[PDB]
């Protein structure tokens, strides 16, 4: 039932791809657990990151990309629709110009493409959260 965390899955995305995450944080929001979603160009975890999605539960969400091992301009968002101790559904919809990250079907963040989504070869879900479901839809 439970997916192993860090969860690493080979995947390739394109305009229309949606990344579905269903899990629960492992700590109360006061202790500030993190959640991270990274879209990699290779199966090796040290590879470049097309889309970096890091949540600091209860505080903020930061997104960035890693190109040739270098972190680019970080984009910060203070919107925290996630609710303390409640299970969440996380969906990242790929659009031609940007990403669409919905929280329980509710828009919270966007990220304009810096690397074309066809470069994604690996998706990893890892941080202080429990993971129950992970699916890619088209």
């Amino acid at each position: 039932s439970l997916l192993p965390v860090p969860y690493t899955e080979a995947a390739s995305l394109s305009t229309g791809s949606t990344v579905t995450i269903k899990g629960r944080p492992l700590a109360c929001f006061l202790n500030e657990p993190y959640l991270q979603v990274d879209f990699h160009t290779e199966m090796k975890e040290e590879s470049d990151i097309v889309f970096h999605f890091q949540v600091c539960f209860g505080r903020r969400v930061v997104m960035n990309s890693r190109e040739y091992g270098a972190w680019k301009q970080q984009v910060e968002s203070k919107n925290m629709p996630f609710q303390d101790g409640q299970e969440f559904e996380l969906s990242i919809s790929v659009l031609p110009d940007k990403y669409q990250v919905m929280v329980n079907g509710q828009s919270s963040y966007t990220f304009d493409h810096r690397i074309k989504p066809e470069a994604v070869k690996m998706v990893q879900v890892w941080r202080d959260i429990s993971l129950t479901k992970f699916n890619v839809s088209y």
Partner: antibody, heavy 111, light 108 residues
Amino acid sequence: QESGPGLVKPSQTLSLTCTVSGYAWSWIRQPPGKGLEWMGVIASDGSTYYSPSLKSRTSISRDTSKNQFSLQLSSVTPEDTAVYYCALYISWSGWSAYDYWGQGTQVTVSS
Amino acid sequence: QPVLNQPSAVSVSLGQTARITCQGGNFGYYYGSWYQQKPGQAPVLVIYKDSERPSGIPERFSGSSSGGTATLTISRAQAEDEADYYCQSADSSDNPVFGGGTHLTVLG
């Protein structure tokens, strides 16, 4: 719309301004007969970026009330002689393209 | 300084199809664009995002891209297409690169 003089003494600081008439302003220069050379970018929403080769010598300012933005390349030497274009982009990325290019202006730096 | 690899000069006969490739660059991650520049005149964007052409650009111009290569296509040459042609991409989101420039000669 490009403006600014073409004579400058070496080791000085020369300025170029680009006017905007009816969303990311960049500077591209062309050394004589050479290929295009990126110099920098300044977004209205975001902040500035620079290229390492020119990073130390390049400064980009903005005047939103005038909707103008100016280039400053300090400590000029005869190597800085080039044809300067200002190109308009319409977030800004490196692979992004510029639809409206400035007419260009020739700047010659020599003793 | 970073420059993309493209031919310096290319000749094509009137009515034939000319193709310019933009290779050698740090592609796969990023997209490619193309500019048409005549001497002493400002460049004009011809192709963006490797597939679409902007309005006003004639149907003669089209672009294709794959792997680490992009191809500029001029299907039905005219005399006025005789000019210098630049491709552009980036080595990184915060650092664009530009090609050496290609002069197209309209023969016949």
